[PDB]
Write an enzyme that holds these catalytic residues in place. Sequence first.
Site, mmCIF file in Angstrom:
data_model
loop_
_atom_site.group_PDB
_atom_site.id
_atom_site.type_symbol
_atom_site.label_atom_id
_atom_site.label_comp_id
_atom_site.label_asym_id
_atom_site.label_seq_id
_atom_site.Cartn_x
_atom_site.Cartn_y
_atom_site.Cartn_z
ATOM 1 N N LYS B 50 -22.670 17.277 12.023
ATOM 2 C CA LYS B 50 -21.449 16.571 12.445
ATOM 3 C C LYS B 50 -20.503 16.239 11.279
ATOM 4 O O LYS B 50 -19.350 15.876 11.507
ATOM 5 C CB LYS B 50 -21.823 15.265 13.151
ATOM 6 C CG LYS B 50 -22.678 15.411 14.405
ATOM 7 C CD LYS B 50 -23.153 14.022 14.893
ATOM 8 N N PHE B 91 -30.263 18.676 0.928
ATOM 9 C CA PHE B 91 -31.461 18.630 0.020
ATOM 10 C C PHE B 91 -32.574 17.797 0.647
ATOM 11 O O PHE B 91 -33.719 18.276 0.790
ATOM 12 C CB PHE B 91 -31.042 18.134 -1.400
ATOM 13 C CG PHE B 91 -32.033 17.274 -2.150
ATOM 14 C CD1 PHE B 91 -31.702 15.967 -2.481
ATOM 15 C CD2 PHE B 91 -33.195 17.814 -2.702
ATOM 16 C CE1 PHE B 91 -32.565 15.169 -3.219
ATOM 17 C CE2 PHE B 91 -34.057 17.019 -3.481
ATOM 18 C CZ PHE B 91 -33.745 15.682 -3.710
ATOM 19 N N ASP B 96 -37.620 16.805 3.867
ATOM 20 C CA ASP B 96 -38.098 15.992 4.982
ATOM 21 C C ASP B 96 -38.689 16.822 6.136
ATOM 22 O O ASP B 96 -39.725 16.466 6.656
ATOM 23 C CB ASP B 96 -36.973 15.058 5.438
ATOM 24 C CG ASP B 96 -37.365 14.157 6.602
ATOM 25 O OD1 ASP B 96 -38.021 13.106 6.368
ATOM 26 O OD2 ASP B 96 -37.022 14.530 7.764
ATOM 27 N N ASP B 100 -42.417 16.198 7.337
ATOM 28 C CA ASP B 100 -42.600 15.751 8.710
ATOM 29 C C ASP B 100 -43.117 16.810 9.672
ATOM 30 O O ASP B 100 -43.342 16.505 10.842
ATOM 31 C CB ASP B 100 -41.305 15.136 9.208
ATOM 32 C CG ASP B 100 -40.911 13.888 8.405
ATOM 33 O OD1 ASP B 100 -41.686 13.413 7.576
ATOM 34 O OD2 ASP B 100 -39.815 13.373 8.583
ATOM 35 N N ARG B 105 -33.939 21.824 13.528
ATOM 36 C CA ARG B 105 -32.964 20.984 12.873
ATOM 37 C C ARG B 105 -31.604 21.606 13.201
ATOM 38 O O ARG B 105 -31.425 22.810 13.069
ATOM 39 C CB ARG B 105 -33.231 20.979 11.369
ATOM 40 C CG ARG B 105 -32.149 20.419 10.446
ATOM 41 C CD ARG B 105 -32.028 18.957 10.508
ATOM 42 N NE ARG B 105 -33.223 18.258 9.968
ATOM 43 C CZ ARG B 105 -33.428 16.951 10.067
ATOM 44 N NH1 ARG B 105 -32.505 16.190 10.639
ATOM 45 N NH2 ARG B 105 -34.521 16.380 9.542
ATOM 46 N N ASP B 167 -42.006 5.456 3.825
ATOM 47 C CA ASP B 167 -42.131 6.176 5.089
ATOM 48 C C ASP B 167 -43.482 6.923 5.199
ATOM 49 O O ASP B 167 -44.236 6.726 6.175
ATOM 50 C CB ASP B 167 -40.908 7.097 5.266
ATOM 51 C CG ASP B 167 -40.977 7.977 6.514
ATOM 52 O OD1 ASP B 167 -41.585 9.057 6.447
ATOM 53 O OD2 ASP B 167 -40.366 7.618 7.534
ATOM 54 N N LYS B 193 -34.706 4.385 2.859
ATOM 55 C CA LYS B 193 -34.719 5.822 3.220
ATOM 56 C C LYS B 193 -33.430 6.336 3.855
ATOM 57 O O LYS B 193 -33.172 7.529 3.821
ATOM 58 C CB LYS B 193 -35.951 6.207 4.071
ATOM 59 C CG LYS B 193 -35.911 5.831 5.569
ATOM 60 C CD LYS B 193 -36.831 6.780 6.419
ATOM 61 C CE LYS B 193 -36.832 6.415 7.901
ATOM 62 N NZ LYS B 193 -37.843 7.211 8.699
ATOM 63 N N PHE B 232 -28.411 2.686 12.438
ATOM 64 C CA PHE B 232 -28.376 4.121 12.518
ATOM 65 C C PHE B 232 -29.815 4.706 12.568
ATOM 66 O O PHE B 232 -30.096 5.610 13.375
ATOM 67 C CB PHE B 232 -27.543 4.711 11.363
ATOM 68 C CG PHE B 232 -27.420 6.213 11.448
ATOM 69 C CD1 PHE B 232 -26.438 6.797 12.260
ATOM 70 C CD2 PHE B 232 -28.327 7.041 10.803
ATOM 71 C CE1 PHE B 232 -26.359 8.181 12.411
ATOM 72 C CE2 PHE B 232 -28.246 8.445 10.954
ATOM 73 C CZ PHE B 232 -27.268 9.002 11.752
ATOM 74 N N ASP B 236 -31.844 6.694 15.432
ATOM 75 C CA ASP B 236 -32.531 7.919 15.151
ATOM 76 C C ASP B 236 -33.971 7.900 15.703
ATOM 77 O O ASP B 236 -34.423 8.863 16.315
ATOM 78 C CB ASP B 236 -32.542 8.197 13.635
ATOM 79 C CG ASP B 236 -33.186 9.495 13.304
ATOM 80 O OD1 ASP B 236 -32.613 10.528 13.664
ATOM 81 O OD2 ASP B 236 -34.259 9.484 12.678
ATOM 82 N N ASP B 237 -34.679 6.809 15.447
ATOM 83 C CA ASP B 237 -36.030 6.602 16.015
ATOM 84 C C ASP B 237 -36.084 6.616 17.560
ATOM 85 O O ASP B 237 -36.995 7.213 18.151
ATOM 86 C CB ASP B 237 -36.660 5.314 15.472
ATOM 87 C CG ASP B 237 -36.899 5.350 13.968
ATOM 88 O OD1 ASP B 237 -36.694 6.385 13.291
ATOM 89 O OD2 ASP B 237 -37.248 4.288 13.441
#
Lengths: 343, 343
Positions: B50, B91, B96, B100, B105, B167, B193, B232, B236-237
């Site tokens: 975005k 990056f 991530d 994860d 993505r 995290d 984070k 934010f 996201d969670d």
Amino acid sequence: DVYAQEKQDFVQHFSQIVRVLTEDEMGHPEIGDAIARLKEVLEYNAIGGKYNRGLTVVVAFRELVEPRKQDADSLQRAWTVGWCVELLQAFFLVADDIMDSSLTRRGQICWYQKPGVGLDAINDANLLEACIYRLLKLYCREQPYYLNLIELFLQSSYQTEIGQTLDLLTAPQGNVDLVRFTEKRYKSIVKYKTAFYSFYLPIAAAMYMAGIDGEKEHANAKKILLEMGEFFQIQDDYLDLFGDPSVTGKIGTDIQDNKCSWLVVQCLQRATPEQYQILKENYGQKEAEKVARVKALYEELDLPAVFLQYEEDSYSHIMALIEQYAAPLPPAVFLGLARKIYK
Amino acid sequence: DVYAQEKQDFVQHFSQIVRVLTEDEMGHPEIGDAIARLKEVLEYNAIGGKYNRGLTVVVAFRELVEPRKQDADSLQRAWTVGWCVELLQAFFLVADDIMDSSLTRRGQICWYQKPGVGLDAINDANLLEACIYRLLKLYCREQPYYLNLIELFLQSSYQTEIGQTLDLLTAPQGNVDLVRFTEKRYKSIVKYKTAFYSFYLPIAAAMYMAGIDGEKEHANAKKILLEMGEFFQIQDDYLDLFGDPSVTGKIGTDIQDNKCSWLVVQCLQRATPEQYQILKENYGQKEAEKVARVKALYEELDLPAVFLQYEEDSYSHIMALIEQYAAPLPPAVFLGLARKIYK
Ligand SMILES: O=P(O)(O)C(O)(Cc1cnc2ccccn12)P(=O)(O)O
Ligand SMILES: O=P(O)(O)C(O)(Cc1cnc2ccccn12)P(=O)(O)O
Ligand SMILES: [Mg+2]
Ligand SMILES: [Mg+2]
Ligand SMILES: [Mg+2]
Ligand SMILES: [Mg+2]
Ligand SMILES: [Mg+2]
Ligand SMILES: [Mg+2]
Ligand SMILES: [Mg+2]
Ligand SMILES: [Mg+2]
């Protein structure tokens, strides 16, 4: 060595480096667990090596800076910047070990292979990298060379990462094409992946700290140091197969990993079409018997003897470059480094 | 939005960014293959989002810098620095996604999941990071804010990496301890984070470019932005489980990955001992049926409704912080960002 004369004291200083990096914690006790992890990462990965790159900053500093200007604080900044080089190495090696599927490093299991670490090591490596800039801010921010050093570390990292890209692109997994393993390609990979950060970076850091910032002086320094770095990587490639891991601290992976090693380049220059097929059949593969066949072929083609000769010729060449390009710096600056790597 | 008014033009500029980063090649054609890889990496990973973080630099710049000072070159530096924020995101996300074990993505397979990429993505991510400092040198080196920006990006990266450590440490694989999933721990993880690099960094970059370098002004800005960043990350969670992946572009992994998600924190605050055992039995595990059971429990405990209420309360809180802390900056600087994230 001038390196042994500064080593115990250099290493001594790691406890201070760790202390100053792991006391971002008073003020911010919410990051305590993270800072504990950082301490673990620092202790596992930046200790256990020979410290030659960090030591080079210290030794060069003392040889380039006037003794009346080598006060307590200045010496401290010098060994801090040497530890920054060590941290740059530490960051790069953690990442390299994962990407090369390595087993051991500095006589212990690679950090990523540790139970409970794994791919979390990627962020650990990024943290080691961040510590460089943290120490430069804490110790050198009010010095006239501060921006020079920040930009030298950043640029050295970029070059190194470009060299890593070439390394990995020339060594695709499961994809054996020996056609790409040329001397020209070899020289380019090692210039970028090793020569900048292992040789040019530490001397350059000490040069900037001593107020030697001229493009001509740095360009002359490079003429020697990049050549020294090329030799150093050829030596690393040779020891990957023929070195004693009790001495090297690490198990070789280049043949399995399909790497554009100096050994494979020299093999290709010498190999009959029959030996070429043997190499094609056995290179870049996990099987122990296939790796053994490649080693056998190298021994058949006298590559250890070829390496021995190369080291003599290379030493003589680098010494010649010191005679040409050392001035106005003390020749000892380069000769000490030469002594350490050609041992 | 003010963001749509600058987006097409911002995105337009990516071709120039790529062109200037992939023309380190005349002079050094030996790195051509590496620069081709860098272009591929840039195109795959910094495009398709975005662009809100990069766009924020641009929009804030225009709102903070006097229109007579918004010349051609200055505007170009502004969208370059916005692209640096995007590259910092790129990056971090590449790394991530590996750590994860993510699948997709931005509506495509994660870079590391691409056949032939794999763990080579680690070095690709390091390269994206290097591009930041490359663009800052190329475009901003003669500006009075140059060191401010270098240090802002470096420090933001360090903070972010500290948050990543928290995290990952709070989310050990195969190791279910819900005891650690507290609100206090949550707030600390997301501050580090997410909040620094997603909110504070872009506005701060524009502040420094506009010559607003005062510690009080930056500290007031942070009071708003860190709170916006916390919201934010909570959003996201929530979307990790309850969002539509055709909209979010990504498949959620938090439950499988044993993450200290806002959802699990809120679950623990509300759950009977019977629901606690269900959560303990099913959290942090790969089985689809166990993940389904966790989602069912969250829906039983009205967590979507709790989130909806939280978003209202949070919006009202952030608007209150803008009233308190915006001055002397235009309120629009923050309100535009508020509008984009609370949509
Ligand atoms: O694994 P080693 O120690 O043998 C190795 O020598 C390590 C190495 C050389 N150059 C770099 C640059 C970045 C990261 C690691 N680097 P190699 O290049 O052979 O992987
Ligand atoms: O994967 P996403 O997009 O859901 C995720 O939101 C990504 C994210 C948030 N903060 C950071 C910091 C560094 C790298 C990635 N970061 P999360 O934090 O949930 O991994
Ligand atoms: Mg290696
Ligand atoms: Mg390697
Ligand atoms: Mg090697
Ligand atoms: Mg290897
Ligand atoms: Mg993630
Ligand atoms: Mg994550
Ligand atoms: Mg998420
Ligand atoms: Mg996750």
